């Protein structure tokens, strides 16, 4: 129902095929504006950027200030920060499991495909491994 209704509000957008996944994708952004009161995902990029600009004018140098605080925190953030979560999807077994386990299964699996950014302690190199793991031609994982 959600899957249908999500596309029902974006059906007048641009439909294309993802060359990566090979899936059917839908893009409403910068689509034709609505002529009815039915829900609409057709949001114009300029109107967002203007409203964002208006925020930077009203609140001076908040963006670069907020970016700094987050960026500086990211550097200090350890990998174990991903343990404090709820039931997480584990790609290895394709079932929901505790975040602490779902993390451990990924670290042990990444060690086989040769991605030891997790060992360094910081989240940045572990995140650097995750985007790189897409490039690997085959991803091996333990299955007891």
């Amino acid at each position: 129902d959600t899957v249908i209704r999500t596309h029902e509000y974006s059906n007048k957008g641009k439909q294309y095929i993802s060359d990566v996944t090979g899936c059917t994708m839908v893009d409403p952004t910068n689509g034709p504006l609505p002529e009815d009161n039915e829900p609409s995902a057709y949001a114009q990029l300029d109107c967002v950027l203007e409203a964002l600009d208006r925020m930077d004018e009203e609140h001076p140098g908040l963006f670069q200030a907020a970016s700094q605080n987050a960026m500086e925190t990211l550097m200090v953030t350890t990998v174990d920060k991903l343990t404090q979560g709820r039931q997480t999807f584990d790609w290895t077994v394709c079932r929901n499991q505790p975040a602490a386990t779902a993390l451990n299964t990924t670290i042990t699996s990444f060690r086989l495909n040769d991605l030891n950014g997790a060992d360094k302690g910081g989240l940045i190199p572990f995140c650097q491994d995750i985007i790189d793991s897409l490039d690997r031609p085959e991803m091996t994982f333990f299955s007891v």
């Binding site: 952004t29 300029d46 203007e50 940045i124 985007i131 490039d135």
Partner: protein
């Protein structure tokens, strides 16, 4: 190069520990090999002092059987392991833990030792580190030009003092032979830029993950940064 040079001179035990120490400070071994050499030489001087030296059941120095050395090598080991050893000794013998990290601890002297390697004047480098410590650790500085400046209470034996000065200039001779001595003399400091670059697959996803009227992400990045939408 300095990279291939260290493979021939030192053993793996000194190379690994040197790289592992630099890894903690977020300093690249390969991009700064002269900085690795400073630690490699600094660890080898400390290693040889504790190698032949041992203790007995009565508790006096002798050369070699036994499973309890006379000197405890702190430099080379990781930070959290080093500071564990640092405090455990200080707390046991009953003396104040030093402000900064140490290199060696002599069980017969019951005092911390601060080792230092320098290029030119050895006596100049001795008084510089005396400012910070004062009377915390017994300093023992050495240089490559056979110029030494030991502590007031000289625990170092005459035969052992030679082995240090022997290896110091032997390496300094090997460096000058292959024209790799000029690399260590010159100054070395570069910014550790935080590297995070996107691969092939994730970049391909970001290219398609853009609004209508954009070829690739580069177009979306420049547009948001440059143009002014007001009105």
């Amino acid at each position: 190069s300095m990279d291939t040079f260290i493979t021939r001179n030192f053993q793996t035990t000194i190379i690994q520990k040197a790289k592992n120490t630099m890894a903690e400070f977020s300093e690249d071994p390969e991009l700064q090999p002269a900085m690795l050499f400073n630690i490699c030489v600094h660890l080898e001087v400390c290693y040889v002092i504790s190698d032949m030296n041992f203790l007995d059941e009565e508790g006096k120095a002798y050369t070699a059987q036994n499973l309890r050395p006379q000197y405890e090598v702190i430099e080379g080991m990781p930070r959290t392991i080093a500071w564990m050893v640092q405090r455990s000794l200080a707390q046991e013998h009953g003396i104040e833990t030093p402000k900064y990290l140490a290199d060696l601890f002599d069980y017969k002297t019951k005092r911390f030792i601060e080792v230092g390697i320098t290029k030119g004047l050895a006596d100049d480098y001795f008084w510089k580190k005396k400012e910070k410590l004062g009377n915390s650790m017994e300093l023992m500085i050495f240089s490559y030009n056979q110029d030494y400046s030991l502590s007031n209470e000289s625990s170092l034996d005459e035969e052992g003092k030679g082995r240090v000065l022997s290896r110091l200039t032997e390496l300094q001779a090997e460096l000058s032979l292959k024209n790799l001595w000029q690399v260590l003399i010159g100054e070395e400091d570069v910014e550790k830029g935080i590297d995070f670059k996107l691969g092939q697959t994730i970049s391909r996803l970001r290219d398609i993950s853009v609004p209508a009227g954009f070829s690739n992400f580069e177009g979306m990045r420049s547009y948001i940064d440059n143009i002014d939408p007001k009105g």
